[PDB]
Enzyme design. Structure first.
Site, mmCIF file in Angstrom:
data_model
loop_
_atom_site.group_PDB
_atom_site.id
_atom_site.type_symbol
_atom_site.label_atom_id
_atom_site.label_comp_id
_atom_site.label_asym_id
_atom_site.label_seq_id
_atom_site.Cartn_x
_atom_site.Cartn_y
_atom_site.Cartn_z
ATOM 1 N N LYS A 20 0.935 -1.199 0.005
ATOM 2 C CA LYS A 20 0.195 0.102 -0.022
ATOM 3 C C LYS A 20 0.889 1.401 -0.057
ATOM 4 O O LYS A 20 0.404 2.479 -0.279
ATOM 5 C CB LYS A 20 -1.216 0.139 1.091
ATOM 6 C CG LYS A 20 -2.161 -0.866 0.628
ATOM 7 C CD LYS A 20 -3.187 -1.313 1.706
ATOM 8 C CE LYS A 20 -2.761 -2.048 3.077
ATOM 9 N NZ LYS A 20 -3.690 -2.404 4.224
ATOM 10 N N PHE A 72 13.046 -4.913 3.712
ATOM 11 C CA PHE A 72 14.174 -5.649 4.614
ATOM 12 C C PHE A 72 13.266 -6.511 5.735
ATOM 13 O O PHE A 72 13.778 -7.596 5.818
ATOM 14 C CB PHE A 72 15.197 -4.783 4.933
ATOM 15 C CG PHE A 72 15.583 -4.808 6.200
ATOM 16 C CD1 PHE A 72 16.567 -5.969 6.854
ATOM 17 C CD2 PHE A 72 15.728 -3.980 7.112
ATOM 18 C CE1 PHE A 72 17.035 -6.159 8.095
ATOM 19 C CE2 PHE A 72 16.164 -3.949 8.470
ATOM 20 C CZ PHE A 72 16.748 -5.053 8.888
ATOM 21 N N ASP A 104 11.169 -11.525 7.955
ATOM 22 C CA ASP A 104 10.279 -12.093 8.941
ATOM 23 C C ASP A 104 9.476 -13.354 8.152
ATOM 24 O O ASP A 104 9.563 -14.237 9.130
ATOM 25 C CB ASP A 104 9.113 -10.897 9.243
ATOM 26 C CG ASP A 104 9.706 -9.896 10.322
ATOM 27 O OD1 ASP A 104 10.879 -10.070 10.757
ATOM 28 O OD2 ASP A 104 9.046 -8.839 10.490
ATOM 29 N N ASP A 123 9.209 -16.976 10.082
ATOM 30 C CA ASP A 123 7.894 -17.589 10.361
ATOM 31 C C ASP A 123 7.355 -18.743 9.383
ATOM 32 O O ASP A 123 6.357 -19.073 9.482
ATOM 33 C CB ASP A 123 6.891 -16.760 10.690
ATOM 34 C CG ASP A 123 6.857 -15.322 10.102
ATOM 35 O OD1 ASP A 123 6.613 -15.349 8.770
ATOM 36 O OD2 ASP A 123 7.110 -14.206 10.592
ATOM 37 N N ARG A 145 2.898 -13.396 1.161
ATOM 38 C CA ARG A 145 3.025 -11.806 1.408
ATOM 39 C C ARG A 145 2.282 -11.176 0.251
ATOM 40 O O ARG A 145 2.684 -11.500 -1.126
ATOM 41 C CB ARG A 145 4.382 -11.492 1.347
ATOM 42 C CG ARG A 145 4.946 -10.082 1.827
ATOM 43 C CD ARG A 145 4.631 -9.654 2.906
ATOM 44 N NE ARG A 145 5.388 -10.124 4.114
ATOM 45 C CZ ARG A 145 5.135 -10.114 5.572
ATOM 46 N NH1 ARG A 145 4.119 -9.116 5.814
ATOM 47 N NH2 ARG A 145 5.822 -10.757 6.296
ATOM 48 N N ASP A 181 9.015 -10.775 20.300
ATOM 49 C CA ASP A 181 7.846 -11.571 19.623
ATOM 50 C C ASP A 181 8.204 -13.149 19.568
ATOM 51 O O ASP A 181 7.512 -13.823 20.237
ATOM 52 C CB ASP A 181 7.442 -10.850 18.194
ATOM 53 C CG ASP A 181 6.099 -11.286 17.795
ATOM 54 O OD1 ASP A 181 5.145 -11.462 18.571
ATOM 55 O OD2 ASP A 181 6.046 -11.202 16.606
ATOM 56 N N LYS A 197 8.271 -3.708 17.437
ATOM 57 C CA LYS A 197 8.179 -4.466 16.352
ATOM 58 C C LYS A 197 7.689 -3.563 15.006
ATOM 59 O O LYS A 197 7.722 -3.815 13.908
ATOM 60 C CB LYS A 197 7.699 -5.706 16.463
ATOM 61 C CG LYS A 197 7.669 -6.707 15.266
ATOM 62 C CD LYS A 197 6.826 -7.905 15.131
ATOM 63 C CE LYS A 197 6.966 -8.354 13.952
ATOM 64 N NZ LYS A 197 6.708 -10.220 13.858
ATOM 65 N N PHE A 236 -3.370 0.604 15.693
ATOM 66 C CA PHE A 236 -3.408 0.049 14.490
ATOM 67 C C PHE A 236 -3.193 -1.410 14.397
ATOM 68 O O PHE A 236 -3.858 -2.119 13.939
ATOM 69 C CB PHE A 236 -2.048 0.743 13.721
ATOM 70 C CG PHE A 236 -1.595 0.133 12.428
ATOM 71 C CD1 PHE A 236 -2.394 0.163 11.149
ATOM 72 C CD2 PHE A 236 -0.511 -0.776 12.352
ATOM 73 C CE1 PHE A 236 -1.993 -0.393 9.995
ATOM 74 C CE2 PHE A 236 -0.184 -1.425 11.099
ATOM 75 C CZ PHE A 236 -0.918 -1.239 10.214
ATOM 76 N N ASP A 281 -5.818 -4.311 13.721
ATOM 77 C CA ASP A 281 -5.125 -5.485 12.830
ATOM 78 C C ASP A 281 -5.409 -6.721 13.309
ATOM 79 O O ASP A 281 -5.857 -7.569 12.352
ATOM 80 C CB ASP A 281 -3.781 -5.170 12.582
ATOM 81 C CG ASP A 281 -3.370 -5.614 11.184
ATOM 82 O OD1 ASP A 281 -3.002 -4.869 10.244
ATOM 83 O OD2 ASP A 281 -3.016 -6.987 11.134
ATOM 84 N N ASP A 282 -5.477 -7.178 14.533
ATOM 85 C CA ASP A 282 -5.641 -8.348 15.322
ATOM 86 C C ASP A 282 -7.115 -8.624 15.411
ATOM 87 O O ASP A 282 -7.582 -9.796 15.159
ATOM 88 C CB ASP A 282 -4.949 -8.422 16.706
ATOM 89 C CG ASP A 282 -3.514 -7.953 16.607
ATOM 90 O OD1 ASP A 282 -2.747 -8.154 15.430
ATOM 91 O OD2 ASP A 282 -3.037 -7.693 17.697
#
Ligand SMILES: O=C(O)Cn1c(C(=O)NCP(=O)(O)O)cc2ccc3ccccc3c21
Ligand SMILES: O=C(O)Cn1c(C(=O)NCP(=O)(O)O)cc2ccc3ccccc3c21
Lengths: 343, 343
Positions: free
Chosen positions: B50, B91, B96, B100, B105, B167, B193, B232, B236-237
């Site tokens: 975005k 980056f 990430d 994970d 993505r 995290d 983070k 935010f 998001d969660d």
């Protein structure tokens, strides 16, 4: 020896380096756990090597600076900047080890191979990179070479990263191609991945700390140091296969790993169409029967003698560079380094 | 919209960003191949999102600067600095995603998952980091905020890296422990983070470019922005599980991935000993039968209502911060951002 002597003070300063980097926990105990890991990252990864790149900064600083400007603080900054080089190196080795799927580093299990680590070591590698600048801010913020060191360590990261990309493109993880194994490529990988960070970065850091910030002085030093870089790696590749593993403290891995080593480059430069095919087979193989065959082809092509000749010409070349480019710096800066690298 | 309008010029400047970063190949064709990969890294990883963090720098710069100081060069630097934020983000996301073990993505295959990439993406992630500073040197070397931006991007990398360590320590890859899922930890992971790099870094960059370098102005801005960061991620969660996947353009992953989400944190804060056990089972499970159970427990605990209440209080809180800390900056800097984040 300047090195053998100061190695103690250099290694003893690491206790402070750690204390200092694990001190932002005081104001923010909320992140204590991450800093506890950050401590473990440093203890495991910055410690264990020879500290020669880090030591070069200390040694070169003493040699470039008038003994009266070498006060408590100046030396505290020299040890720190020395440690930043080690921290930069720790960041590359942790990441290189993941990328090449390695098992050991300095005879010990690779950080990422340790239980509970794995790919989390990608972040650990980044934290090692972050610490360079954390220390640089902590000790040099007020110094006039501050911005020069940040830019130096940054240019040095980029150079290595470029070198690594080049290496990775040249020798993929399961690709027996010797077309891309040209000397021009070998020389290129060495300049970017090793020579710059190993020889230019340590002396250059000391130079900036001494007030030596001129483009020409750095170009002159870069000229000398990058050629020392080139030999260092060429000797490293020779010793990889033909070195006595007692004195070297390491056993041959190169051929088994499809590495763009100096040996293969020379072998490929001097090989009959059938000798090309003999190599096209046995290279990149884990089998001791196949590794023995390459070792034997290199020997047949008198590469130990081609290396001996190269070492002679190289030392003769470095002295010519020291003569031409060391001025106005003390030649001893370069001479000391060359003595430690050559035989 | 300031954003919707400039998104075109921002994305069109990327063609130059790339041309500029792939220009050290001219003097050194020896590394052309590495730069060719470096091009591919940027095209694939900086493009596709975005660009909101990057756009914030452009938008905030226009708002903080007198329209007469907004000449060709000033805007070229604003777009560039905007792009540095995107490059910083590229980056982190590349790295990430490896850490994970992610598949996609922005609906596309993760860079590391692409054939011929794999763990080489660790180096690619580093090159994306290197470019921030390469551009910063290329466009801002001569500007008085130059050192301020280097330090900002560096502090921002460290903050995120710390957040990521936190995290990673909180939610390991196969560890169903909810003891470490405290709100104090959730709030901490979010500050380090996400909040810092996503909200503080973009506005802060514009501030420095505008001449606003004062510790107090930055502390005041940090106060406001970090709280916007917190919301935010909380939203998001919430949206991760209760959002309409049409408008969101993403489907629920959180519970299946043992994520320290705001939802679980609240669920754990308001749960009977048996409700703790119900969660202790179904959380971190890939099975749709088990994912449905948590969704149902959250609903039972009226978390969508707990979130609605939180959103109300949060917006009420951000306005109080904007009132208190925006001065002497234009409140519009913050108001514009809040409008885009809230509903
Ligand atoms: O540390 C090394 O790998 C090689 N090395 C050596 C070395 O190990 N010599 C053999 P020894 O330790 O058994 O006596 C010394 C020395 C000095 C300055 C250096 C600078 C940049 C890069 C390397 C360097 C360096
Ligand atoms: O880009 C995003 O993930 C969220 N986001 C959004 C957003 O996506 N809104 C929904 P839309 O694009 O469908 O209309 C806008 C906007 C603006 C400034 C921002 C700054 C830092 C961080 C996020 C930001 C941000």
């Amino acid at each position: 020896d300047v090195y053998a002597q100061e190695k103690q003070d250099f290694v003893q300063h690491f206790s402070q380096i750690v204390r200092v980097l694990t001190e932002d926990e005081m104001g923010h105990p909320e992140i204590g756990d991450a800093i506890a890991r950050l401590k473990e990252v440093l203890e495991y990864n910055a410690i264990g090597g020879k500290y020669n790149r880090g030591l070069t900064v200390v040694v070169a600083f003493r040699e470039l600076v008038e003994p009266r400007k070498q006060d408590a603080d100046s030396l505290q900054r020299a040890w720190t900047v020395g440690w930043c080089v080690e921290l930069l190196q720790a960041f590359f080795l942790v990441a290189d080890d993941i990328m090449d799927s390695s098992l050991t580093r300095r005879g010990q299990i690779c950080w990422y191979q340790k239980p509970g680590v794995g790919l989390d070591a990608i972040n650990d590698a980044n934290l090692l990179e972050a610490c360079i600048y954390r220390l640089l801010k902590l000790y040099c913020r007020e110094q006039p070479y501050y911005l020069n060191l940040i830019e130096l360590f940054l240019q040095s990261s980029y150079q290595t990263e470029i070198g690594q990309t080049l290496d990775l493109l040249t020798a993929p993880q399961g690709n027996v191609d010797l077309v891309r194994f040209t000397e021009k490529r070998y020389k290129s990988i060495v300049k970017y991945k090793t020579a710059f960070y190993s020889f230019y970065l340590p002396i250059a850091a000391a130079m900036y700390m001494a007030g030596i910030d001129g483009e020409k002085e750095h170009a002159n030093a870069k000229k000398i140091l990058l050629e020392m870089g080139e030999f260092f790696q060429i000797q490293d590749d020779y010793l990889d296969l033909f070195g006595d593993p007692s004195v070297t403290g390491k056993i041959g891995t190169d051929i088994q790993d499809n590495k763009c080593s100096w040996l293969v480059v020379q072998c490929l430069q001097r090989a009959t169409p059938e000798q090309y095919q003999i190599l096209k087979e046995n290279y990149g193989q884990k089998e001791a029967e196949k590794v023995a065959r390459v070792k034997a082809l290199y020997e047949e092509l008198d590469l130990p003698a081609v290396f001996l000749q190269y070492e002679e010409d190289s030392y003769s070349h470095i002295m010519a560079l020291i003569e031409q480019y060391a001025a106005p710096l003390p030649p001893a800066v370069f001479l000391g380094l060359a003595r430690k690298i050559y035989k």
